[PDB]
Design a binder for these strands. Sequence first.
DNA 1: AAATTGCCGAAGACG
DNA 2: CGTCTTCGGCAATT
Length: 354
Amino acid sequence: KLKKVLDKLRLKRKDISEAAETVNKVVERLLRRMQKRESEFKGVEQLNTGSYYEHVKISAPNEFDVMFKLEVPRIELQEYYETGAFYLVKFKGNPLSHFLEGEVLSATKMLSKFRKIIKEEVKEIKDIDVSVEKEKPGSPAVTLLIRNPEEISVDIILALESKGSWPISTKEGLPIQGWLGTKVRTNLRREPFYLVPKNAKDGNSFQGETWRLSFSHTEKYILNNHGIEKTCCESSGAKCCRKECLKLMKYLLEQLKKEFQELDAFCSYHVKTAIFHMWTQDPQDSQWDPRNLSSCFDKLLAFFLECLRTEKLDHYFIPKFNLFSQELIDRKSKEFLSKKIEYERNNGFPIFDK
DNA sequence: AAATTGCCGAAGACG
DNA sequence: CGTCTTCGGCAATT
Ligand SMILES: Nc1nc2c(ncn2[C@@H]2O[C@H](COP(=O)(O)O[C@@H]3C[C@@H](COP(=O)(O)OP(=O)(O)OP(=O)(O)O)O[C@H]3n3cnc4c(=O)[nH]c(N)nc43)C[C@H]2O)c(=O)[nH]1
Ligand SMILES: [Mg+2]
Ligand SMILES: [Mg+2]
Ligand SMILES: [Zn+2]
Protein backbone atom coordinates (compact mmCIF):
# COMPACT_ATOMS: atom_id res chain seq x y z
CA LYS A 1 0.00 0.00 0.00
CA LEU A 2 2.72 2.50 0.89
CA LYS A 3 4.33 1.36 -2.35
CA LYS A 4 1.14 2.28 -4.22
CA VAL A 5 1.09 5.72 -2.58
CA LEU A 6 4.75 6.30 -3.54
CA ASP A 7 3.85 5.36 -7.14
CA LYS A 8 1.21 8.06 -7.19
CA LEU A 9 3.50 10.59 -5.47
CA ARG A 10 6.28 9.87 -7.96
CA LEU A 11 6.81 12.70 -10.45
CA LYS A 12 6.27 12.11 -14.20
CA ARG A 13 9.11 12.94 -16.60
CA LYS A 14 6.72 14.59 -19.04
CA ASP A 15 5.57 16.93 -16.26
CA ILE A 16 9.17 17.44 -15.16
CA SER A 17 10.29 18.37 -18.69
CA GLU A 18 7.46 20.84 -19.30
CA ALA A 19 7.84 22.50 -15.89
CA ALA A 20 11.65 22.73 -15.86
CA GLU A 21 11.70 24.22 -19.34
CA THR A 22 9.52 27.16 -18.30
CA VAL A 23 11.01 27.60 -14.82
CA ASN A 24 14.56 27.63 -16.17
CA LYS A 25 13.64 30.25 -18.76
CA VAL A 26 12.05 32.57 -16.21
CA VAL A 27 14.82 32.22 -13.63
CA GLU A 28 17.65 32.57 -16.17
CA ARG A 29 16.02 35.80 -17.27
CA LEU A 30 15.59 37.24 -13.76
CA LEU A 31 19.15 36.28 -12.86
CA ARG A 32 20.62 37.91 -15.97
CA ARG A 33 18.61 41.05 -15.05
CA MET A 34 20.13 41.21 -11.56
CA GLN A 35 23.58 40.74 -13.02
CA LYS A 36 23.29 43.89 -15.16
CA ARG A 37 24.17 46.38 -14.16
CA GLU A 38 24.05 49.39 -11.88
CA SER A 39 22.21 47.37 -9.26
CA GLU A 40 23.20 46.47 -5.71
CA PHE A 41 22.70 42.81 -6.56
CA LYS A 42 25.07 42.68 -9.53
CA GLY A 43 27.18 39.77 -8.27
CA VAL A 44 24.38 37.35 -7.33
CA GLU A 45 24.79 33.71 -8.24
CA GLN A 46 22.15 31.01 -8.45
CA LEU A 47 21.76 27.99 -6.19
CA ASN A 48 18.80 25.71 -6.73
CA THR A 49 17.34 24.43 -3.44
CA GLY A 50 14.46 22.59 -1.78
CA SER A 51 12.47 19.46 -2.59
CA TYR A 52 12.48 19.50 -6.41
CA TYR A 53 16.28 19.67 -6.60
CA GLU A 54 16.66 17.25 -3.68
CA HIS A 55 14.33 14.78 -5.47
CA VAL A 56 11.81 14.65 -2.61
CA LYS A 57 9.18 16.84 -4.28
CA ILE A 58 5.88 14.96 -4.28
CA SER A 59 2.78 14.65 -6.49
CA ALA A 60 3.65 17.26 -9.14
CA PRO A 61 6.64 19.47 -10.10
CA ASN A 62 4.65 22.60 -9.24
CA GLU A 63 6.87 24.36 -6.69
CA PHE A 64 10.52 25.31 -7.21
CA ASP A 65 12.94 27.02 -4.82
CA VAL A 66 15.95 29.01 -5.95
CA MET A 67 18.43 31.23 -4.08
CA PHE A 68 20.11 34.28 -5.57
CA LYS A 69 23.12 34.41 -3.27
CA LEU A 70 25.24 37.53 -2.82
CA GLU A 71 28.73 37.11 -1.38
CA VAL A 72 29.19 39.78 1.26
CA PRO A 73 32.74 39.87 2.62
CA ARG A 74 33.62 40.98 6.14
CA ILE A 75 30.15 40.88 7.64
CA GLU A 76 29.66 40.82 11.38
CA LEU A 77 26.80 38.92 12.95
CA GLN A 78 25.06 39.78 16.17
CA GLU A 79 22.73 37.12 17.47
CA TYR A 80 19.17 38.39 17.84
CA TYR A 81 18.41 37.76 21.50
CA GLU A 82 19.31 34.12 22.16
CA THR A 83 17.40 32.66 19.24
CA GLY A 84 20.41 31.02 17.59
CA ALA A 85 18.76 31.30 14.16
CA PHE A 86 18.25 35.05 13.83
CA TYR A 87 20.86 37.77 13.40
CA LEU A 88 21.52 41.43 12.90
CA VAL A 89 24.11 42.00 10.16
CA LYS A 90 26.71 44.77 10.44
CA PHE A 91 30.04 45.47 8.74
CA LYS A 92 33.72 45.95 9.34
CA GLY A 93 31.15 53.37 -0.88
CA ASN A 94 29.53 49.95 -1.26
CA PRO A 95 26.22 49.17 -3.06
CA LEU A 96 24.36 47.83 -0.02
CA SER A 97 24.83 51.15 1.83
CA HIS A 98 21.31 52.05 0.64
CA PHE A 99 20.01 49.25 2.84
CA LEU A 100 21.73 50.43 5.99
CA GLU A 101 19.81 51.52 9.05
CA GLY A 102 22.51 52.78 11.32
CA GLU A 103 25.30 50.22 11.02
CA VAL A 104 22.65 47.54 10.53
CA LEU A 105 22.02 45.96 7.14
CA SER A 106 18.21 45.88 7.05
CA ALA A 107 16.77 42.63 5.66
CA THR A 108 13.53 44.48 4.86
CA LYS A 109 15.11 47.34 2.93
CA MET A 110 17.29 44.99 0.91
CA LEU A 111 14.50 42.51 0.23
CA SER A 112 12.15 45.33 -0.80
CA LYS A 113 14.54 46.54 -3.48
CA PHE A 114 15.22 42.94 -4.58
CA ARG A 115 11.47 42.41 -4.87
CA LYS A 116 11.05 45.69 -6.73
CA ILE A 117 13.57 44.65 -9.40
CA ILE A 118 12.07 41.16 -9.83
CA LYS A 119 8.64 42.72 -10.37
CA GLU A 120 10.00 45.13 -12.95
CA GLU A 121 11.68 42.28 -14.81
CA VAL A 122 8.60 40.03 -14.53
CA LYS A 123 6.62 42.86 -16.18
CA GLU A 124 9.01 42.64 -19.14
CA ILE A 125 8.26 38.95 -19.72
CA LYS A 126 5.75 38.73 -22.58
CA ASP A 127 5.99 35.13 -23.78
CA ILE A 128 5.22 33.46 -20.45
CA ASP A 129 2.28 33.93 -18.06
CA VAL A 130 4.11 34.85 -14.85
CA SER A 131 3.13 37.20 -12.03
CA VAL A 132 4.53 37.82 -8.59
CA GLU A 133 2.46 36.82 -5.59
CA LYS A 134 1.40 39.39 -3.03
CA GLU A 135 4.06 39.87 -0.34
CA LYS A 136 3.87 37.73 2.78
CA PRO A 137 5.05 39.67 5.84
CA GLY A 138 8.20 38.18 7.33
CA SER A 139 8.90 35.83 4.41
CA PRO A 140 12.28 35.92 2.63
CA ALA A 141 10.70 34.81 -0.68
CA VAL A 142 9.65 36.68 -3.79
CA THR A 143 7.15 34.17 -5.13
CA LEU A 144 6.38 33.87 -8.84
CA LEU A 145 3.20 32.35 -10.15
CA ILE A 146 3.68 30.70 -13.54
CA ARG A 147 0.84 29.46 -15.74
CA ASN A 148 2.34 26.91 -18.05
CA PRO A 149 -0.85 26.63 -18.48
CA GLU A 150 -0.57 24.53 -15.30
CA GLU A 151 0.19 26.43 -12.10
CA ILE A 152 3.81 26.45 -10.97
CA SER A 153 5.13 28.57 -8.12
CA VAL A 154 8.77 29.63 -7.84
CA ASP A 155 10.27 31.13 -4.68
CA ILE A 156 13.20 33.39 -5.46
CA ILE A 157 15.18 33.74 -2.23
CA LEU A 158 17.72 36.48 -1.75
CA ALA A 159 20.62 35.27 0.42
CA LEU A 160 23.84 36.66 1.85
CA GLU A 161 26.75 34.23 1.52
CA SER A 162 29.47 34.32 4.16
CA LYS A 163 32.70 32.34 3.85
CA GLY A 164 33.69 32.61 7.50
CA SER A 165 33.26 29.98 10.20
CA TRP A 166 29.63 29.24 11.03
CA PRO A 167 27.98 31.11 13.95
CA ILE A 168 28.65 29.42 17.31
CA SER A 169 25.00 28.53 17.82
CA THR A 170 25.72 25.83 15.17
CA LYS A 171 28.80 24.42 16.90
CA GLU A 172 27.04 21.36 18.32
CA GLY A 173 24.60 21.03 15.41
CA LEU A 174 24.83 18.73 12.36
CA PRO A 175 25.30 15.63 14.58
CA ILE A 176 26.29 13.34 11.68
CA GLN A 177 29.56 11.96 13.17
CA GLY A 178 28.33 8.37 13.52
CA TRP A 179 26.39 8.44 10.25
CA LEU A 180 28.11 10.53 7.56
CA GLY A 181 31.23 10.92 9.66
CA THR A 182 33.75 13.48 10.89
CA LYS A 183 35.46 14.26 7.56
CA VAL A 184 32.06 14.98 5.98
CA ARG A 185 30.97 17.15 8.91
CA THR A 186 34.22 19.14 8.93
CA ASN A 187 34.15 19.60 5.15
CA LEU A 188 30.51 20.73 5.17
CA ARG A 189 31.29 23.25 7.91
CA ARG A 190 34.16 24.70 5.86
CA GLU A 191 31.63 25.63 3.16
CA PRO A 192 29.93 29.08 3.20
CA PHE A 193 26.85 29.69 5.32
CA TYR A 194 23.83 31.73 4.24
CA LEU A 195 21.46 34.31 5.64
CA VAL A 196 18.01 34.93 4.21
CA PRO A 197 15.85 38.00 4.84
CA LYS A 198 13.31 36.09 6.92
CA ASN A 199 12.46 38.30 9.90
CA ALA A 200 12.20 37.05 13.50
CA LYS A 201 8.64 37.32 14.80
CA ASP A 202 8.90 39.29 18.04
CA GLY A 203 5.55 39.38 19.79
CA ASN A 204 2.89 40.90 17.53
CA SER A 205 5.22 42.12 14.77
CA PHE A 206 8.38 41.19 12.89
CA GLN A 207 11.78 42.71 13.54
CA GLY A 208 12.29 43.97 10.00
CA GLU A 209 16.08 44.13 10.17
CA THR A 210 16.69 40.49 11.16
CA TRP A 211 18.05 37.71 8.96
CA ARG A 212 17.86 33.95 9.49
CA LEU A 213 20.51 31.29 8.95
CA SER A 214 19.97 28.99 5.95
CA PHE A 215 21.71 25.68 5.35
CA SER A 216 19.85 24.80 2.12
CA HIS A 217 23.13 23.97 0.37
CA THR A 218 24.22 21.59 3.15
CA GLU A 219 20.78 19.99 3.26
CA LYS A 220 20.88 19.39 -0.49
CA TYR A 221 24.28 17.68 -0.12
CA ILE A 222 22.96 15.52 2.71
CA LEU A 223 19.95 14.37 0.69
CA ASN A 224 22.27 13.43 -2.21
CA ASN A 225 24.80 11.77 0.14
CA HIS A 226 22.65 10.20 2.83
CA GLY A 227 23.98 6.69 3.43
CA ILE A 228 26.60 5.50 5.89
CA GLU A 229 27.92 3.52 2.89
CA LYS A 230 29.31 5.57 0.02
CA THR A 231 27.38 3.47 -2.51
CA CYS A 232 23.98 4.00 -0.90
CA CYS A 233 21.45 4.45 -3.71
CA GLU A 234 24.25 4.42 -6.36
CA SER A 235 24.30 2.18 -9.42
CA SER A 236 26.76 -0.28 -7.79
CA GLY A 237 25.24 -0.07 -4.32
CA ALA A 238 21.96 -0.83 -2.53
CA LYS A 239 18.80 1.23 -2.65
CA CYS A 240 17.55 2.53 0.71
CA CYS A 241 14.11 3.92 1.65
CA ARG A 242 15.24 7.14 3.37
CA LYS A 243 13.83 9.50 0.76
CA GLU A 244 10.68 7.42 0.34
CA CYS A 245 9.95 7.81 4.07
CA LEU A 246 10.46 11.53 3.80
CA LYS A 247 8.02 11.70 0.86
CA LEU A 248 5.32 9.80 2.75
CA MET A 249 5.60 11.94 5.85
CA LYS A 250 5.48 15.11 3.71
CA TYR A 251 2.41 13.78 1.93
CA LEU A 252 0.65 12.96 5.20
CA LEU A 253 1.26 16.51 6.40
CA GLU A 254 0.30 18.11 3.07
CA GLN A 255 -2.98 16.20 3.06
CA LEU A 256 -3.76 17.08 6.68
CA LYS A 257 -2.88 20.77 6.13
CA LYS A 258 -5.18 20.79 3.10
CA GLU A 259 -8.26 20.05 5.16
CA PHE A 260 -7.47 21.59 8.54
CA GLN A 261 -6.71 25.30 8.76
CA GLU A 262 -5.63 24.77 12.38
CA LEU A 263 -2.47 23.19 10.97
CA ASP A 264 -1.34 26.42 9.30
CA ALA A 265 1.66 26.72 11.63
CA PHE A 266 3.13 23.39 10.46
CA CYS A 267 5.36 23.06 7.42
CA SER A 268 7.44 20.54 5.50
CA TYR A 269 10.65 21.80 7.13
CA HIS A 270 9.33 20.34 10.39
CA VAL A 271 9.13 16.95 8.71
CA LYS A 272 12.55 17.36 7.06
CA THR A 273 14.06 18.32 10.44
CA ALA A 274 12.43 15.31 12.10
CA ILE A 275 13.81 12.87 9.54
CA PHE A 276 17.31 14.39 9.80
CA HIS A 277 17.15 13.45 13.48
CA MET A 278 15.92 9.98 12.58
CA TRP A 279 18.78 9.44 10.14
CA THR A 280 21.16 10.33 13.00
CA GLN A 281 19.42 7.98 15.41
CA ASP A 282 19.37 5.13 12.87
CA PRO A 283 22.57 5.61 10.82
CA GLN A 284 22.91 2.11 9.36
CA ASP A 285 21.76 1.71 5.76
CA SER A 286 20.45 -1.68 6.84
CA GLN A 287 17.90 0.16 8.98
CA TRP A 288 16.53 1.79 5.83
CA ASP A 289 16.21 -1.29 3.61
CA PRO A 290 13.31 -0.90 1.14
CA ARG A 291 11.95 -4.19 2.54
CA ASN A 292 11.31 -2.36 5.81
CA LEU A 293 9.60 0.77 4.45
CA SER A 294 6.46 0.26 6.58
CA SER A 295 8.50 -0.01 9.75
CA CYS A 296 10.73 2.97 8.94
CA PHE A 297 7.69 5.11 8.17
CA ASP A 298 6.13 4.00 11.45
CA LYS A 299 9.26 4.87 13.49
CA LEU A 300 9.39 8.28 11.84
CA LEU A 301 5.71 8.82 12.74
CA ALA A 302 6.39 7.77 16.34
CA PHE A 303 9.32 10.17 16.62
CA PHE A 304 7.29 12.99 15.09
CA LEU A 305 4.45 12.36 17.56
CA GLU A 306 6.89 12.40 20.48
CA CYS A 307 8.27 15.71 19.21
CA LEU A 308 4.75 17.07 19.25
CA ARG A 309 3.94 15.72 22.71
CA THR A 310 7.15 17.01 24.29
CA GLU A 311 6.82 20.29 22.36
CA LYS A 312 10.40 19.89 21.19
CA LEU A 313 11.87 19.65 17.71
CA ASP A 314 15.33 21.12 17.65
CA HIS A 315 16.65 22.66 14.46
CA TYR A 316 19.16 20.17 13.01
CA PHE A 317 21.93 22.76 12.61
CA ILE A 318 21.06 24.95 15.60
CA PRO A 319 20.21 22.71 18.55
CA LYS A 320 18.94 25.40 20.94
CA PHE A 321 16.41 26.61 18.36
CA ASN A 322 13.18 24.72 19.10
CA LEU A 323 10.86 24.67 16.05
CA PHE A 324 8.07 23.42 18.30
CA SER A 325 8.42 26.06 21.02
CA GLN A 326 5.25 27.48 22.52
CA GLU A 327 6.38 30.87 21.18
CA LEU A 328 6.24 29.45 17.64
CA ILE A 329 3.39 26.97 17.82
CA ASP A 330 0.59 26.89 20.36
CA ARG A 331 0.27 23.72 22.43
CA LYS A 332 -3.31 23.18 21.21
CA SER A 333 -2.17 23.12 17.57
CA LYS A 334 0.39 20.43 18.35
CA GLU A 335 -2.24 18.42 20.24
CA PHE A 336 -4.56 18.82 17.27
CA LEU A 337 -1.92 17.45 14.91
CA SER A 338 -1.12 14.51 17.21
CA LYS A 339 -4.78 13.44 17.21
CA LYS A 340 -5.03 13.59 13.42
CA ILE A 341 -1.77 11.69 12.88
CA GLU A 342 -2.67 9.02 15.44
CA TYR A 343 -6.04 8.58 13.76
CA GLU A 344 -4.51 8.07 10.29
CA ARG A 345 -1.86 5.81 11.80
CA ASN A 346 -4.47 3.69 13.61
CA ASN A 347 -6.80 3.35 10.64
CA GLY A 348 -4.56 2.50 7.70
CA PHE A 349 -4.05 6.08 6.53
CA PRO A 350 -7.38 6.71 4.73
CA ILE A 351 -6.18 10.24 3.91
CA PHE A 352 -3.63 8.72 1.52
CA ASP A 353 -6.60 7.85 -0.72
CA LYS A 354 -7.20 11.58 -1.24
C1' DA B 1 34.85 36.73 -17.96
C1' DA B 2 30.11 35.51 -19.45
C1' DA B 3 28.50 31.48 -22.10
C1' DT B 4 28.98 26.95 -24.01
C1' DT B 5 30.24 22.19 -23.41
C1' DG B 6 30.32 17.49 -22.19
C1' DC B 7 30.46 14.30 -18.31
C1' DC B 8 27.84 11.39 -15.43
C1' DG B 9 24.74 10.61 -11.14
C1' DA B 10 19.74 10.39 -9.80
C1' DA B 11 15.94 8.45 -10.98
C1' DG B 12 11.68 7.97 -14.37
C1' DA B 13 9.92 4.55 -18.15
C1' DC B 14 9.45 0.43 -19.88
C1' DG B 15 9.52 -4.10 -20.55
C1' DC C 1 15.36 -6.44 -12.54
C1' DG C 2 18.44 -4.08 -16.80
C1' DT C 3 18.72 -0.59 -20.17
C1' DC C 4 17.44 3.33 -21.87
C1' DT C 5 16.56 8.23 -21.26
C1' DT C 6 16.30 13.45 -19.36
C1' DC C 7 17.60 16.95 -16.02
C1' DG C 8 20.82 18.98 -12.93
C1' DG C 9 25.46 20.24 -11.22
C1' DC C 10 30.14 20.99 -12.18
C1' DA C 11 34.04 23.38 -13.97
C1' DA C 12 37.27 23.67 -17.77
C1' DT C 13 37.75 26.27 -21.62
C1' DT C 14 36.46 29.44 -24.91
N1 LIG D 1 16.56 28.43 0.30
C1 LIG D 1 15.88 28.70 1.39
N2 LIG D 1 14.61 29.10 1.37
C2 LIG D 1 13.96 29.37 2.50
C3 LIG D 1 14.56 29.22 3.66
N3 LIG D 1 13.68 29.55 4.58
C4 LIG D 1 12.54 29.87 4.01
N4 LIG D 1 12.73 29.73 2.72
C5 LIG D 1 11.83 30.00 1.61
O1 LIG D 1 10.86 30.83 2.13
C6 LIG D 1 9.66 30.32 1.95
C7 LIG D 1 8.91 30.66 3.23
O2 LIG D 1 9.70 30.46 4.37
P1 LIG D 1 8.97 30.14 5.55
O3 LIG D 1 9.82 30.11 6.79
O4 LIG D 1 7.95 31.22 5.88
O5 LIG D 1 8.28 28.70 5.46
C8 LIG D 1 9.01 27.55 5.06
C9 LIG D 1 8.29 26.90 3.99
C10 LIG D 1 8.33 25.44 4.24
C11 LIG D 1 9.21 24.72 3.22
O6 LIG D 1 9.41 25.41 2.01
P2 LIG D 1 10.32 24.91 1.01
O7 LIG D 1 11.39 25.75 1.05
O8 LIG D 1 9.77 25.09 -0.28
O9 LIG D 1 10.76 23.42 1.22
P3 LIG D 1 10.83 22.19 0.39
O10 LIG D 1 12.02 21.50 0.95
O11 LIG D 1 11.22 22.56 -0.95
O12 LIG D 1 9.70 21.38 0.60
P4 LIG D 1 8.33 21.42 -0.18
O13 LIG D 1 7.36 21.37 0.83
O14 LIG D 1 8.28 20.18 -0.78
O15 LIG D 1 8.40 22.47 -1.02
O16 LIG D 1 8.92 25.28 5.47
C12 LIG D 1 8.97 26.51 6.11
N5 LIG D 1 10.18 26.65 6.87
C13 LIG D 1 10.26 26.88 8.14
N6 LIG D 1 11.51 26.96 8.46
C14 LIG D 1 12.20 26.77 7.39
C15 LIG D 1 13.47 26.76 7.24
O17 LIG D 1 14.14 26.96 8.22
N7 LIG D 1 14.00 26.55 6.03
C16 LIG D 1 13.14 26.35 4.98
N8 LIG D 1 13.56 26.13 3.77
N9 LIG D 1 11.86 26.38 5.19
C17 LIG D 1 11.39 26.58 6.40
C18 LIG D 1 9.93 28.93 1.89
C19 LIG D 1 11.16 28.83 1.14
O18 LIG D 1 10.94 29.01 -0.19
C20 LIG D 1 15.82 28.82 3.68
O19 LIG D 1 16.45 28.66 4.70
N10 LIG D 1 16.49 28.57 2.59
MG1 LIG E 1 9.74 23.81 -2.00
MG1 LIG F 1 8.87 27.01 -1.22
ZN1 LIG G 1 20.15 5.55 -0.11
